[PDB]
């Protein structure tokens, strides 16, 4: 007699364990999330993300 459809929008962040592949076929799984202070930095101060 009646139908109710509910649209639910979820915005998920990135989690350790999610599968993320590159462009040339090098797939991978995120191990952990590291703070910026532990990442290796260049001579100018730019921290490497990956």
């Amino acid at each position: 007699l009646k139908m109710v459809k509910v649209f639910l929008a979820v915005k998920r962040r990135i989690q350790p364990g999610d599968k993320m592949a590159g462009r040339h076929g090098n797939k991978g799984v995120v191990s952990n999330v590291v703070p910026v202070e532990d990442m290796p930095y260049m001579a100018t101060g730019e921290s490497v993300d990956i």
Partner: protein
């Protein structure tokens, strides 16, 4: 011993000079101050945004070119320096065609806003934009989950990048005393003097457990 020497290359990015340190004291002090200047300094950011016409963060409002999420990211991009207090509330009123900058908001006497060359949104029609903001104090990174009302992430970090290098200073002493320079690039919120002052305060409060 002589005090920190301040160079002024850019009004947003300064450089401090510490000299003369002993042999084997430049690298540890530089790395400790770099890590503390990166991930310890508290700041101010926008936590929640209350708009009367916008119900949730996925709807479309008439008269606006961009979506609501672009306005939320542009409000996350700006930086607010507050003199005193742990909470504040800023409102903006802008109608008619034209761009909406960060300087068009209504601020208090203690709440200081950067001039804001980055735009927030783009208005086309003659629609009034009544938007209420909220500023809170904190340190680090706090997500929206763990804390008609919207919620926004906040990155309480006025410092962008910290670099340092150890150079030798030719001085008549018992050994080869080395100096170091630290160039701090901020968003204009915090100064390079009180940043290393509260970094040394954090180090002195953390080293107070021994003894």
């Amino acid at each position: 011993p002589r005090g920190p020497q301040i160079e002024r290359l850019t009004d947003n990015r300064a450089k401090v000079v510490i000299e003369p340190l002993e042999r084997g004291y430049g690298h540890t002090l530089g790395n400790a101050l770099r890590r503390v200047l990166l991930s310890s300094i508290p700041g101010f950011a926008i936590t929640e945004v209350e708009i009367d016409g916008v119900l949730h963060e996925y709807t479309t409002v008439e008269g606006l070119q961009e979506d609501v999420l672009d306005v939320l990211l542009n409000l996350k991009d700006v930086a607010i320096r507050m003199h005193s207090g742990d909470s504040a509330t800023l409102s903006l009123s802008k109608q008619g065609p034209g761009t909406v900058t960060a300087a068009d908001i209504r601020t208090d006497h203690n709440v200081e806003i950067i001039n804001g060359d980055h735009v927030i949104c783009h208005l086309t029609k003659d629609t009034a934009l009544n938007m209420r903001l909220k500023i809170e104090r904190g340190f680090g990174y706090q997500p929206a989950a763990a804390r008609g009302r919207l919620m926004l992430d906040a990155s309480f970090s006025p410092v962008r990048r910290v670099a340092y290098a150890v150079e030798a200073a030719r001085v008549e002493q018992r050994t080869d005393l080395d100096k170091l320079v630290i160039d701090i690039e901020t968003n204009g919120t915090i100064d390079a003097e009180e940043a290393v002052r509260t970094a040394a305060d954090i180090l002195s409060d953390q080293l107070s457990v021994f003894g």
